[PDB]
């Protein structure tokens, strides 16, 4: 994506009803800090999800260690809060060649203060004045009270610790809802083969067959409630099972 917002107004995209391309995630390998939870990253290729939340933002190259489920520091204190029990992956890389511009990048922002720690996964776009001392400023700025937000200072004159990371966070769950988002061998003809089609499993001799399905159908069956004939998913064809 071409434009991530800051952490005071981070973008969130509910994703479901599609398939996961988890391969090139690992094959990318241009990513600085790439960690996961729940169960191992090699294991998550197939172990799949009811409803994922893909939310992304841009933070500094020093504060990204604050992004960890159950830590402190400003981004996890007042800006964006990972929960106490978390599943997803934190994906983090540098975008110094895009974000930090000569003449100064000050598009990006963050919240520096709030009168409590932040509830998990809840943004804070309320840019009203907080009153640290007791003297009421009441919407306008003043004494004992500060402005809530502040920018970052990004230029390519920054060191490597001050480079902008485009942290995208993937968060997962499991419900009574089915695995709506879920990740992914040459067929044998006229030869005894073990097989699986679409999860249907058995062992037989697969042949070409002229029995004619209705389109929506999957299996055929015989009188005996055996699985007699199946249709090849990738290339629709009517395959007997003997």
């Amino acid at each position, epitope marked *: 994506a071409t434009r991530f917002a800051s952490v005071y107004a981070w973008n969130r995209k509910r994703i479901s009803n599609c398939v996961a391309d988890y391969s090139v995630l690992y094959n990318s390998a241009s990513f600085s800090t790439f960690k996961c939870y729940g169960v191992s990253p090699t294991k998550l290729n197939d172990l799949c999800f009811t409803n994922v939340y893909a939310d992304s933002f841009v933070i500094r190259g020093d504060e990204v260690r604050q992004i960890a489920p159950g830590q402190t520091g400003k981004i996890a204190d007042y800006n964006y809060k990972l929960p106490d029990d978390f599943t997803g992956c934190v994906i983090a890389w540098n975008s110094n060649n895009l974000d930090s511009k000569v003449g100064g990048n000050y598009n990006y922002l963050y919240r520096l203060f709030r009168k409590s720690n932040l509830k998990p996964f809840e943004r804070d776009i309320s840019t009203e004045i907080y009153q640290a001392g007791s003297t009421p400023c009441n919407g*306008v700025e*003043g004494f004992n009270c*500060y402005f809530p937000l502040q920018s970052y200072g990004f230029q390519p004159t920054n060191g490597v610790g001050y480079q902008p990371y485009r942290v995208v966070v993937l968060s997962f769950e499991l419900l009574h809802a089915p695995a709506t988002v879920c990740g992914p061998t040459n067929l044998v003809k006229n030869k005894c083969v073990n097989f699986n089609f679409n999860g249907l499993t058995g062992t037989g001799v697969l042949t070409e067959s002229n029995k004619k399905f209705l389109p929506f159908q999957q299996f055929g069956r015989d009188i005996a409630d055996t699985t007699d004939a199946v249709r090849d998913p990738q290339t629709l064809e009517i395959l007997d099972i003997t």
Partner: antibody
Framework: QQLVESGGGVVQPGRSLRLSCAAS????????MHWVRQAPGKGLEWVAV????????YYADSVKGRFTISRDNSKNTLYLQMNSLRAEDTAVYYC????????????WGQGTLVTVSS | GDIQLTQSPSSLSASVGDRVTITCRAS??????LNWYQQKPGKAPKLLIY???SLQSGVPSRFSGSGSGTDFTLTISSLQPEDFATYYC?????????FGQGTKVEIK
């Protein structure tokens, strides 16, 4: 990034003249905004605030003429109607912002002349 | 009542390469909430220092702020031929805000 102002002109005293000032580059919406006055040869005198992030309006009691201030946030614009005029207010006005130890957002309009004379 | 400012001196005709200390004094004890502006007469007031002790983008350290409480200081150093203009201090402590009367640094 940029601030534009409504047109100044010569107005008879006791009248009213709405002041429009539209923003560009970044919104009015998340910030406050101010008005200040510069008479020729005189110092910059603050006039009035606006505070959109709640809603509150503060006026200078030095020039307490009920110069009313409110918004058009969706156009990033701000309206202060010149009420209860008197000739020494004949000056140039600016749309303003104060760096309150946190930001660096002090952006100033181009300046238009209000004139109070018959 | 209001908070009075005291900008001293209200003008100082200066020369090349000086180090001018334009003082803005305050009637109350203000934490650091004071600013500084560049105005050639007819321009927009270009902010110079924020919170009385911090520089600004585009403005090098030839300007330099310090002070707190009542006493605030504009530390102009190595005075440049473009720096000769009408300048201003600024409270943001309470409401109303007042600005100083201005100090015109000008060529001797």
């Amino acid at each position: 990034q940029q601030l534009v102002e409504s047109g100044g002109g010569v107005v008879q005293p006791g009248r009213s003249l709405r002041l429009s000032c539209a923003a560009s580059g970044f919104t009015f919406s998340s910030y406050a905004m101010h008005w200040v006055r510069q008479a020729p040869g005189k110092g910059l005198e603050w006039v009035a605030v606006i505070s959109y992030d709640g809603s509150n309006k503060y006026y200078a009691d030095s020039v307490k003429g009920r110069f009313t201030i409110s918004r058009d946030n969706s156009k990033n614009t701000l309206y202060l109607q010149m009420n209860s005029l008197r000739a020494e207010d004949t000056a140039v006005y600016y749309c303003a912002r104060h760096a309150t130890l946190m930001n660096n957002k002090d952006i100033w309009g181009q300046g238009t002349l209000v004139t109070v004379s018959s | 009542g209001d908070i009075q400012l005291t900008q001293s001196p209200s003008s100082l005709s200066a020369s090349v390469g000086d180090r001018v200390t334009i003082t803005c004094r305050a009637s109350q004890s203000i934490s650091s909430y004071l600013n500084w502006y560049q105005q050639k007469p007819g321009k927009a007031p270009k902010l110079l220092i924020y919170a009385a002790s911090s520089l600004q983008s585009g403005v090098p350290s030839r300007f330099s702020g310090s002070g707190s409480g009542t006493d605030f200081t504009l530390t102009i150093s190595s005075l440049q031929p473009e720096d000769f203009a009408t300048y201003y201090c600024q409270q943001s402590y309470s409401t109303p805000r007042t600005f100083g009367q201005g100090t015109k640094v000008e060529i001797k």
